[PDB]
Design an enzyme around this catalytic site. Structure first.
Site, short mmCIF file in Angstrom:
data_model
loop_
_atom_site.label_atom_id
_atom_site.label_comp_id
_atom_site.label_asym_id
_atom_site.label_seq_id
_atom_site.Cartn_x
_atom_site.Cartn_y
_atom_site.Cartn_z
N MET A 19 -8.14 -70.28 -54.69
CA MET A 19 -7.02 -71.20 -54.51
C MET A 19 -7.25 -72.40 -55.43
O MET A 19 -7.65 -72.21 -56.57
CB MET A 19 -6.92 -71.61 -53.03
CG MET A 19 -6.48 -70.47 -52.11
SD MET A 19 -4.83 -69.85 -52.54
CE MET A 19 -4.43 -68.83 -51.10
N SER A 20 -7.02 -73.62 -54.96
CA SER A 20 -7.06 -74.77 -55.86
C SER A 20 -8.45 -75.20 -56.34
O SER A 20 -8.55 -76.12 -57.15
CB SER A 20 -6.34 -75.96 -55.23
OG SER A 20 -4.95 -75.73 -55.18
N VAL A 21 -9.51 -74.54 -55.89
CA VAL A 21 -10.78 -74.72 -56.57
C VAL A 21 -10.62 -74.29 -58.03
O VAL A 21 -11.32 -74.77 -58.92
CB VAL A 21 -11.93 -73.92 -55.89
CG1 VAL A 21 -13.18 -73.96 -56.75
CG2 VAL A 21 -12.22 -74.53 -54.51
#
Length: 384
Positions: free
Chosen positions: A103-105
Site C-alpha cells: 500500500m502507501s509504504v
C-alpha cells in the site's frame, strides 16, 4: 494530452500493447515473456499451514508479542538490528519468502527514487512540477514545486470517501486498474492526474496519493525509463534483495507508484537498512547522506495538521514521502493502509517491518494497537 511516456518495449507505439493487441507482432515478442503485465496471473508452486514465530531476543521483554501480532492481523513481521535479523513472525499460510502488498509504504520507495535523481542532479526540488511535466499545466500541479509534491503540501480537491464512485480516491483506483472501470473514466493514471484541481493554496500538509504518482511521472520524464524500471535501477537492484519486487501497472504499463508495490518483509527491511546507512546499499549509493538526514530531521511541524497523526505524535511531520513521528526516539516510518509499516528506529540502528491485513484500512483503534507494538519493540531493543 499527457505527453510522451516510456514505451513498454523498444520501438513500441504509445499505449501498446493493450489487452486486445498483445498477441500481434511486434508486441508479442515482449508480451509472451511478460504476460502477467497484461493478464491477472497466479503462481504455480515449485514447492510441494502454521504460524512461524522466532521472536528472539525480544520475546523475553514482550512475552505476549505473538498474541499482539495476531490481534493486529499481522501477516509478516521482521526486526533487523544492525545487519542481523533478530526477530521474525509470519502467520499460518504466509511463507517467509512470500510477497506482501505495501500500500502507501510504496510512496516511501518512490520518494527514494526521486532522491536518487536529486543526488545525480537530474531533479531540482525547487523547480515547478511543470518544468518536468509541462502537460500538468492547468491542473492543481501547475504552480507547486517538486518539493511541495514530495512533502505533500498542496491543497487538492480529492474526495477520500471511497464508497462514492464519484470520489477522486475511487476514480484514481479505476483509472489505474485497481477497480473495474466505469464509462467516462480517465484512460490511465496520467490522464486522471491532469483532472485534479485545487484552490491554489500550498504550505499545509494534505495526504494525497496523487502526489506520489506525479513524482513517478516526473521520474519517467527525467530518465526516459518506465517507472517499473526506474524503481529497479535506482533502488531495488542495489539492495541485494532475495526476490524481485512486483508493482501493479495500469493499461499503459505505468507502475502504480503510490500503492502497488509488493515484496518480502526481509527485502523491505533492506530499504530501511539503506536509510540507516546514510543512503548507501550493497550495490551502491542510493540517495545522498543529506537526503537521509532531511528525512530523519522531519518536515515543517506547522504544515502537519492531520490529527490522525498528531494525536499520537504531537511534534510529528511529513517529508519526502516519509512520516516523521518527532517522538523522543526520532522514529520515522513508511505507512500504508491496513497496517503496513516500514519503521525506522535510528536509536538502536534497527528497522521494523510489519505487514498486515487489518479488516479496516484506517481507524484510531488499529493505529493505537499497531503503534503500541512498534514502540514497545523499539524500546525492547534499547541497551539495558
Amino acid at each position: 494530452s499527457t505527453g510522451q511516456h516510456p514505451a513498454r518495449y523498444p520501438g513500441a507505439a504509445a499505449g501498446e500493447p493493450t489487452l486486445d493487441s498483445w498477441q500481434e507482432p511486434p508486441h508479442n515478442r515482449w508480451a509472451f515473456a511478460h504476460l502477467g503485465e497484461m493478464v491477472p496471473s497466479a503462481a504455480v508452486s515449485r514447492r510441494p499451514g502454521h504460524a512461524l514465530a522466532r521472536l528472539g531476543a525480544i520475546a523475553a521483554q514482550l512475552p505476549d508479542l505473538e498474541q499482539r501480532l495476531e490481534q493486529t492481523y499481522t501477516d509478516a513481521f521482521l526486526v533487523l538490528r544492525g545487519t542481523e535479523v533478530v526477530a521474525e513472525y509470519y502467520r499460518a499460510g504466509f511463507a517467509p519468502d512470500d510477497r506482501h502488498l505495501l500500500m502507501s509504504v510504496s510512496k516511501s520507495l518512490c520518494g527514494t527514487v526521486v532522491g536518487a535523481l536529486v543526488d545525480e542532479g537530474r531533479i531540482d526540488p525547487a523547480q515547478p512540477v511543470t518544468e518536468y511535466v509541462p502537460e500538468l499545466a492547468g491542473s492543481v500541479y501547475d504552480g507547486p514545486s517538486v518539493l511541495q509534491v514530495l512533502d505533500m503540501q498542496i491543497s487538492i480537491d480529492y474526495n477520500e470517501d471511497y464508497v462514492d464512485p464519484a470520489s477522486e480516491v475511487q476514480t484514481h483506483d479505476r483509472s489505474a486498474g485497481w477497480r473495474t472501470r466505469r464509462h467516462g473514466d480517465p484512460a490511465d493514471t496520467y490522464e486522471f492526474l491532469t483532472t485534479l484541481r485545487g484552490d491554489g493554496s500550498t504550505g499545509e500538509f494534505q495526504y494525497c496519493s496523487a502526489n506520489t504518482d506525479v513524482l513517478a511521472w516526473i521520474v519517467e520524464r527525467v530518465t526516459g525509463l518506465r517507472y517499473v524500471e526506474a524503481l529497479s535501477t535506482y533502488l531495488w537492484a542495489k539492495l541485494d534483495a532475495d526476490r524481485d519486487a512486483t508493482i501493479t501497472v495500469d493499461t499503459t504499463g505505468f507502475g502504480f507508484a503510490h500503492g502497488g508495490v509488493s515484496c518480502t518483509a526481509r527485502d523491505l527491511a533492506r530499504v530501511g537498512r539503506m536509510m540507516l546507512d546514510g543512503g548507501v546499499a550493497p550495490g551502491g549509493r542510493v540517495v545522498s547522506e543529506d537526503w537521509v538526514r532531511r528525512v530523519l530531521a522531519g518536515g515543517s511541524h506547522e504544515a502537519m495538521t492531520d490529527k490522525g497523526f498528531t494525536n499520537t505524535f504531537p511534534d510529528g511531520s511529513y517529508t519526502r514521502q516519509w512520516w516523521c513521528t518527532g517522538n523522543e526516539r526520532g522514529n520515522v516510518s513508511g505507512i500504508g493502509i491496513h497496517g503496513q509499516n516500514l519503521w525506522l528506529d535510528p536509536l538502536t540502528d534497527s528497522v521494523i517491518v510489519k505487514l498486515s491485513s487489518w479488516p479496516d484500512p484506517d481507524t484510531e483503534h488499529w493505529h493505537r494497537l499497531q503503534n503500541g507494538i512498534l514502540l514497545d519493540v523499539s524500546r525492547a531493543l534499547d541497551a539495558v
